[PDB]
Amino acid sequence: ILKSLSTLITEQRNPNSVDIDRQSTLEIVRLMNEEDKLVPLAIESCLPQISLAVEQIVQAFQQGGRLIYIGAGTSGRLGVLDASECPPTFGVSTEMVKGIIAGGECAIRHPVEGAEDNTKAVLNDLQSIHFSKNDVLVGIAASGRTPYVIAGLQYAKSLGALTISIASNPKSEMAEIADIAIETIVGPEILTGSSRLKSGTAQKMVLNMLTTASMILLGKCYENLMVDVQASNEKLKARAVRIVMQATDCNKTLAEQTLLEADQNAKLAIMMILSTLSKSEAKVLLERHQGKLRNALSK
Amino acid sequence: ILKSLSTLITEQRNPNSVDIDRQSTLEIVRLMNEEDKLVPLAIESCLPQISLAVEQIVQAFQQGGRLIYIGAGTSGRLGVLDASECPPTFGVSTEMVKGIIAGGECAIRHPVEGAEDNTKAVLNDLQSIHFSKNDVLVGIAASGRTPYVIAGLQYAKSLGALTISIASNPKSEMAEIADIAIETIVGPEILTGSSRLKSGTAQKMVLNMLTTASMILLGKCYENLMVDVQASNEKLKARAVRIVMQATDCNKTLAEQTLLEADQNAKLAIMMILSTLSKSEAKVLLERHQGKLRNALSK
Numbered sequence: 001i002l003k004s005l006s007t008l009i010t011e012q013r014n015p016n017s018v019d020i021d022r023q024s025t026l027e028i029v030r031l032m033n034e035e036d037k038l039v040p041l042a043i044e045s046c047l048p049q050i051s052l053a054v055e056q057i058v059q060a061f062q063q064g065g066r067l068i069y070i071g072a073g074t075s076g077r078l079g080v081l082d083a084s085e086c087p088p089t090f091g092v093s094t095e096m097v098k099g100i101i102a103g104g105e106c107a108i109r110h111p112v113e114g115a116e117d118n119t120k121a122v123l124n125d126l127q128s129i130h131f132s133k134n135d136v137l138v139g140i141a142a143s144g145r146t147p148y149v150i151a152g153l154q155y156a157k158s159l160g161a162l163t164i165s166i167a168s169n170p171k172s173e174m175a176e177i178a179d180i181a182i183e184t185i186v187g188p189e190i191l192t193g194s195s196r197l198k199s200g201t202a203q204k205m206v207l208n209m210l211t212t213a214s215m216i217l218l219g220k221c222y223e224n225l226m227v228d229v230q231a232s233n234e235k236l237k238a239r240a241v242r243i244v245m246q247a248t249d250c251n252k253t254l255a256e257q258t259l260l261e262a263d264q265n266a267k268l269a270i271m272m273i274l275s276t277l278s279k280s281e282a283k284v285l286l287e288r289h290q291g292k293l294r295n296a297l298s299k
Numbered sequence: 300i301l302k303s304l305s306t307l308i309t310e311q312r313n314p315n316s317v318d319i320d321r322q323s324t325l326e327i328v329r330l331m332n333e334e335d336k337l338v339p340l341a342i343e344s345c346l347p348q349i350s351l352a353v354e355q356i357v358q359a360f361q362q363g364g365r366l367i368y369i370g371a372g373t374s375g376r377l378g379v380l381d382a383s384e385c386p387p388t389f390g391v392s393t394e395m396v397k398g399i400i401a402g403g404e405c406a407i408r409h410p411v412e413g414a415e416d417n418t419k420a421v422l423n424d425l426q427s428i429h430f431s432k433n434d435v436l437v438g439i440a441a442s443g444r445t446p447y448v449i450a451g452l453q454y455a456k457s458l459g460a461l462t463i464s465i466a467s468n469p470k471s472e473m474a475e476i477a478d479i480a481i482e483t484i485v486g487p488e489i490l491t492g493s494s495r496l497k498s499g500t501a502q503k504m505v506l507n508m509l510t511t512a513s514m515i516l517l518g519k520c521y522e523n524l525m526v527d528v529q530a531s532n533e534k535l536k537a538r539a540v541r542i543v544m545q546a547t548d549c550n551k552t553l554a555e556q557t558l559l560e561a562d563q564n565a566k567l568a569i570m571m572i573l574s575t576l577s578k579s580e581a582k583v584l585l586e587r588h589q590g591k592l593r594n595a596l597s598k
Binding site: 001002003005006011013014017018019020021022025026028029030032033036037039040041043044047048050051054055072073074077078080081083084085087088089094108109110111112113114115116117143145146147190191192193194196197200201204205208209212213216217219221222223224225226229230232233234235237238239241242243246294 | 300301302303304305310312313316317318319320321324325327328329331332335336338339340342343346347349350353354357372373376377379380383384386387388393407408409410411412413414415416442445446489490491492493495496499500503504507508511512515516518520521522523524525528529531532533534536537538540541545551591592593
């Protein structure tokens with residue numbers, strides 16, 4: 001059934017924490033923090049595989065496929081949490097990046113019995129979203145041995161889809177199945193086996209990179225500006241006008257006056273501000289260039 | 300109108316990423332990695348305020364109070380994330396830690412028009428759970444000025460509950476309304492305003508400290524072993540045996556039978572074995588020392 005968690009870094013005891021139940025309020029947090037320092041280092045070793053991951057996702061994005069995340073508990077929850085930010089940040093379809101967690105919606109707030117052992121359930125979760133060859137499955141689990149995720153990668157592989165694993169123990173079985181193996185080696189957790197801590201931080205960090213970088217490549221932003229933001233509150237309604245001014249050194253309320261001379265679409269707005277085109281002509285420029293403001297602005 | 304935005308760091312541009320969209324794919328994720336490196340260092344400056352908050356929270360817990368997180372968007376989902384792992388890790392009640400997100404549950408997967416700007420609702424939400432003065436309120440917002448969170452903090456103060464603010468801008472209204480202000484200064488985000496990144500990472504590490512430190516101080520572990528684990532899947536089940544053996548040096552066979560007897564309670568099982576008592580007497584001697592496995596046994 002298991003009995004060889006012994007060989008896994010993720011089940012291993014951290015030396016500098018053996019008397020953590022004895023240490024002080026400040027000793028404990030300092031330690032955790034000292035341990036958190038290791039997380040960005042371990043992402044750093046992983047960057048070239050991460051780069052390649054991104055570039056192949058753009059490719060898929062471009063053939064019309066989707067970025068699909070799978071994971072149990074924390075890993076699952078973090079997949080939904082990256083997928084959730086992509087529309088209001090980048091302006092894309094809510095379907096473009098979907099996070100799937102074992103146990104369905106209830107698993108978001110609380111664990112499900114054996115949800116991570118349910119090899120049949122993943123096959124239904126993936127079938128229900130019409131998972132296809134054009135898609136990319138990113139399988140996520142610190143141990144690299146979660147049956148749910150393992151079976152998920154397999155079906156994906158069997159449909160000829162691009163597969164990526166994100167695990168914390170090297171040479172894992174998820175790593176063997178997948179096409180790109182991302183290996184977050186963070187060392188033993190402060191609490192032995194608590195992958196919610198370091199490993200779930202690494203996982204957030206990669207996911208973030210995966211969506212942020214691909215979206216950049218698709219011209220879903222201009223310079224370092226969030227030109228495709230959905231402004232759905234006061235802060236972003238303001239950042240909107242702020243962003244039009246930042247791109248085009250514009251006086252002032254022309255920034256406002258172009259925003260609703262379309263809709264709050266900073267990208268369109270600055271396009272018809274810089275290129276001095278009509279709203280409809282600014283648009284069709286952008287359409288021919290897949291929304292890449294730098295290309296449509298020419299040169 | 301509400302800008303104001305020029306002031307805040309969270310809204311500033313990151314000079315190290317002006318031509319990020321005209322950069323190599325290896326170059327983008329490496330930029331990100333570099334910025335991620337800055338995040339644990341930011342947490343390091345919050346170590347005294349963070350330890351301050353832990354102690355205070357250990358007390359409300361000991362007074363039968365609850366830890367309660369609030370936020371909209373990414374901060375909200377992180378709050379749900381942190382709380383969701385406390386029951387399965389530390390064996391406590393689903394009520395001891397609760398994440399509440401603006402927009403409510405419908406916000407768990409996607410944004411909700413202007414939910415972060417709601418003065419009411421935060422009232423409603425904080426009454427459906429009957430938030431009392433014994434309860435602790437943690438307001439999370441990178442900007443430091445989100446309406447929902449401020450309103451939430453005001454209602455908790457003008458009530459006498461302990462209040463904690465986590466934010467990424469110095470001298471934030473939230474930080475002033477609050478007793479303990481934790482201020483995670485993480486600098487400009489590579490994508491201007493995409494606080495789902497460093498600030499989101501910084502907020503995950505703070506919340507992980509608050510809960511993981513607390514539960515250690517309250518006895519939810521022995522040494523660095525995760526006793527109080529709930530065996531949900533085949534992995535944690537095997538790990539339960541691993542805990543009893545690492546703590547007693549007692550061979551696979553006995554540990555199993557003991558756990559089978561102690562209903563998969565590793566803390567009880569560890570107690571029955573080394574103190575050679577029964578489940579009845581181990582269970583009572585343990586509450587005599589408040590489930591602190593190192594007092595009960597020894598002392």
